[PDB]
Amino acid sequence: TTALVCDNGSGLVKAGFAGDDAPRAVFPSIVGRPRHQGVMVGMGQKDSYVGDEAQSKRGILTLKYPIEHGIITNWDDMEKIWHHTFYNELRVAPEEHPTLLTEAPLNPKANREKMTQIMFETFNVPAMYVAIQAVLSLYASGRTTGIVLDSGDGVTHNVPIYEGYALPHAIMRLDLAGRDLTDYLMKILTERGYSFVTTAEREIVRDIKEKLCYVALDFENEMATAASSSSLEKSYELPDGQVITIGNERFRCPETLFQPSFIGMESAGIHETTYNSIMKCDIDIRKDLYANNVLSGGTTMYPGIADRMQKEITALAPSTMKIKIIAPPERKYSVWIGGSILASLSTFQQMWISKQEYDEAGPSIVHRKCF
Amino acid sequence: VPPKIPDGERVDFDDIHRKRVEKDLNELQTLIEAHFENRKKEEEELISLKDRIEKRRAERAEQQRIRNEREKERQNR
Amino acid sequence: MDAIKKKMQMLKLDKENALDRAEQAEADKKAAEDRSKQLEDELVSLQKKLKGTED
Amino acid sequence: MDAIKKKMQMLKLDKENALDRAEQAEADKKAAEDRSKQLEDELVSLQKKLKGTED
Ligand SMILES: Nc1ncnc2c1ncn2[C@@H]1O[C@H](COP(=O)(O)OP(=O)(O)O)[C@@H](O)[C@H]1O
Ligand SMILES: [Mg+2]
């Protein structure tokens, strides 16, 4: 039979059968209970709208993501999300399909063990396998080397790989991602008068960020230009009218990636953690990693980031090496495409964690040889 | 110990052709076909239908004027 | 619109590939010509050594 | 329209420029490589005649 390539993610759940080009169903991972009282009788009001249904009734819900930073903080809601994904968005019972979840690097063990225990006890799948979210993004590019920066919505991690041999001592995981950029944008919009507070209006700020923000090639020059002319002010129409005008908030929101001091984080930007991740590698594979830097994940879709990052790394790196940044147009679904490719391989067909194996060793089987 | 992947045979970077070159031409041609058929179905039919509705609207206007005038003529007392 | 963006992306993929190939070929030419000229210098030094041996 | 034409023409020009530059570089690379081979072949015989002279 065919395998189910699910990809929990944090912000958008992407799923679909193995062997295709794009995920079949992509929908936000939010579960929102209603918060008001409700007076109409017999309206058929449910107790929790999940997935894309709660992005249409969000006016009277309190949306809450079940995955904070890679890790899962609310297991009941995550179980509800998985149940919805299997039964309503794909309509395939899990009793007859292997599953291939994905997990960020350096995550707590208990999260992974609970994930496999749920998949084997509640949904009762035949066999499931957990894979690191960066190796798949490297599969999708058709490479076999390269250092991949997978800046998702929950957590940004940077896994270097050479000739198929991952370097476990050079993984640099940073917890700045799309959600923190949304919060920072929502916080700097208040400088013009627009106040978004409700958890429903966070979605509106996210839409503003997606449609308007861009990464500046040079930050100081843009700050000077936006403060003199008015060629940058782009307007946007809220879900009820009252258009708003975003000035130099456009390139200040995604600039947080390269200067995490804006949101008070100490660490260095995504332009310098990649160079540090390279320098921890051996001295003989640094040229190949320099030449095959891969971008993935949703948050790396800002217009103009593949040039800013290249300029920064070229500034840091030695002058002789060639710096090349692979930015495929299908960046958002790169991890899932790689997952489909991996699940479609014949050599991989014996790596699944078969159910009888789980019955013999318990949930701690995932840390064992079947990784 | 870290997992040990059993040794296989092949391949990689050879499916990039079979997943890229396909849509490099088929997708472009199919989308061009879709745009052509949608424009043909939509624009000319919409303009013709709007002209037809405009003519019917003018006829309704004439009927309204005639009825209003005759009723005002009779009722004027 | 829709197809126009994809066509632009194709035209950009061609751009990147052609430019990268051009740069790589230029680097190859630089390396090969440096190799040839160093070999020629070695040949010259051998001629001079032969001259000293002849003397 | 206007933007599509100019952007498409400029990008095709970029592709053609890169391609022709790469071809010129590769031609010079091949010529330099063959000349280098000639230098090697002559240098070996120069060494042989030098060795005979020294003997
Ligand atoms: N076109 C876009 N431009 C800018 N940011 C985007 C765009 N699309 C998605 N994002 C950001 O990326 C996030 C989605 O990232 P995603 O790759 O789905 O995360 P995950 O790894 O959990 O799947 C969204 O929250 C949004 O903030
Ligand atoms: Mg991801």
The tokens of D47 are what? 């060494």
Q: What is the DSSP letter of A89?
A: I
**CA-based Rg of chain D, rounded to a whole angstrom?**
24
Q: How far is the CA of A271 from the centre of ligand 1 (A)?
A: 19
DSSP SS3 for C21: helix
Which helix (H) or strand (E) is D1 found in, with range?
A: none
Q: How far is the CA of A334 from the centre of ligand 2 (A)?
A: 9
**Alpha carbons A157 and A178: distance in angstroms, whole number:** 13
CATH of domain A178-256: 3.90.640.10
| Number of other residues whose CB lies within 10 A of the CB of residue D24 | 14
Tell me which residue has its CA closest to atom 4 in ligand 1: A210
**Alpha carbons A146 and A269: distance in angstroms, whole number:** 20
CB within 8 Å of B73: residues ≥ 6 apart: none
Tell me which residue has its CA closest to atom 21 in ligand 1: A152
Distance of residue C7 Cα from the nearest chain B Cα, in angstroms: 7
The single residue listed with the structure tokens 């006829």 is: B59
Which helix (H) or strand (E) is A50 found in, with range?
A: strand A49-50
The residue numbers preceding gaps of C to N over 2.5 A in chain C are: none
Determine, for residues A371 and B2 on separate chains, whether the beta-carbon distance falls below 8 Å: yes
Work out which ligand 1 atom sits closest to the CA atom of A67. 22
**Alpha carbons C55 and C49: distance in angstroms, whole number:** 10
Distance of residue C1 Cα from the nearest chain D Cα, in angstroms: 11
Specify whether the backbone of A293 is left (phi greater than 0), alpha (psi in -120 to 50) or beta: beta
Q: A93 with A126: CB under 8 angstroms?
A: no
Q: A248 with A229: CB under 8 angstroms?
A: no
The single residue listed with the structure tokens 């059993």 is: B6
The DSSP string of A304-363 is THHHHHHHHHHHHS-SSS---EE--TT-TTHHHHHHHHHHT-SGGGG-SEEHHHHHHH-G
CB within 8 Å of A299: residues ≥ 6 apart: A151, A152, A153, A156, A177, A178, A181, A257
**Alpha carbons A349 and A343: distance in angstroms, whole number:** 8
User: By C-alpha distance, which of A251, A188, A181 is closest to A221?
Assistant: A251
- CATH class belonging to A4-137+333-360: alpha beta
* Cα A136 from chain centroid (whole Å): 13
Way the structure was solved: cryo-EM
The tokens of A163 are what? 């000739």
Which amino acid makes up residue B49? L
**Alpha carbons B56 and B48: distance in angstroms, whole number:** 13
CB within 8 Å of A226: residues ≥ 6 apart: A232, A247, A248, A250, A251
CB within 8 Å of D16: residues ≥ 6 apart: C18
Determine, for residues A351 and B9 on separate chains, whether the beta-carbon distance falls below 8 Å: no
Which helix (H) or strand (E) is A147 found in, with range?
A: strand A146-151
Cis previous bond, B11, omega within 30: yes
Q: B15 with A338: CB under 8 angstroms?
A: no
Work out which ligand 1 atom sits closest to the CA atom of A332. 17
Which helix (H) or strand (E) is A14 found in, with range?
A: strand A13-15
How many Cα atoms are found within 13 Å in the side-chain-facing hemisphere of A191?
11
User: By C-alpha distance, which of A325, A333, A329, A270 is closest to A298?
Assistant: A333
Rounded to a whole number, what is the distance in angstroms from the first to the last CA of chain A?
22
User: By C-alpha distance, which of A272, A232, A268 is closest to A252?
Assistant: A232
Q: How far is the CA of A170 from the centre of ligand 2 (A)?
A: 19
Give Cα separations from D31 to C26, C30, D36 (angstroms): 14, 12, 9
**CA-based Rg of chain A, rounded to a whole angstrom?**
22
Q: Which residues is A156 bridged to in the sheet?
A: A151, A174
DSSP SS3 for C36: helix
**Alpha carbons A182 and A195: distance in angstroms, whole number:** 13
Pairing of strands A165-166, A156-162: antiparallel
User: By C-alpha distance, which of A109, A151, A157, A101 is closest to A131?
Assistant: A101
Q: Is B74 exposed, middle or buried (0-12, 13-18, 19+ CB in 10 A)?
A: exposed
**CA-based Rg of chain B, rounded to a whole angstrom?**
33
Resolution in Å, one decimal place: 5.2
Which amino acid makes up residue A254? P
**Alpha carbons A160 and A149: distance in angstroms, whole number:** 9
**Alpha carbons A142 and A144: distance in angstroms, whole number:** 7
User: By C-alpha distance, which of A97, A103, A101 is closest to A127?
Assistant: A97
Q: A236 with A201: CB under 8 angstroms?
A: no
Choose the residue to mutate in A210, A256, A295 for probing ligand 1, maximizing ligand atoms within 8 Å of C-beta: A210
**Exposed e or buried b for every residue in A342-353, given b needs 16+ CB within 10 A?**
bbbeeebeebbb
The single residue listed with the structure tokens 């208990």 is: A110
Q: D19 with C18: CB under 8 angstroms?
A: yes
**Alpha carbons A330 and A298: distance in angstroms, whole number:** 10
Q: Three-state SS across chain B?
A: CCCCCCCCCCCCCCHHHHHHHHHHHHHHHHHHHHHHHHHHHHHHHHHHHHHHHHHHHHHHHHHHHHHHHHHHHHHCC
Pairing of strands A293-296, A325-326: parallel
The single residue listed with the structure tokens 């309704």 is: B60
User: By C-alpha distance, which of A147, A64, A78, A67 is closest to A108?
Assistant: A67
**Alpha carbons A298 and A151: distance in angstroms, whole number:** 7
How many Cα atoms are found within 13 Å in the side-chain-facing hemisphere of D6?
3
CA-angle at B12, arms to B5 and A365, nearest 5°: 25
Q: Which residues is A4 bridged to in the sheet?
A: A17, A99
The tokens of A232 are what? 């940058």
DSSP H helical ranges for chain A: 75-84, 109-121, 133-140, 178-188, 201-212, 219-226, 249-252, 270-279, 286-291, 305-316, 334-343, 355-361
**Alpha carbons A100 and A19: distance in angstroms, whole number:** 13
**Alpha carbons A343 and A331: distance in angstroms, whole number:** 19
User: By C-alpha distance, which of A307, A296, A351 is closest to A216?
Assistant: A307
| Ligand 1 residue neighbourhood (C-beta within 6 Å) | A 9-12, 152-154, 178, 182, 206, 209-210, 297-299, 301-302, 332
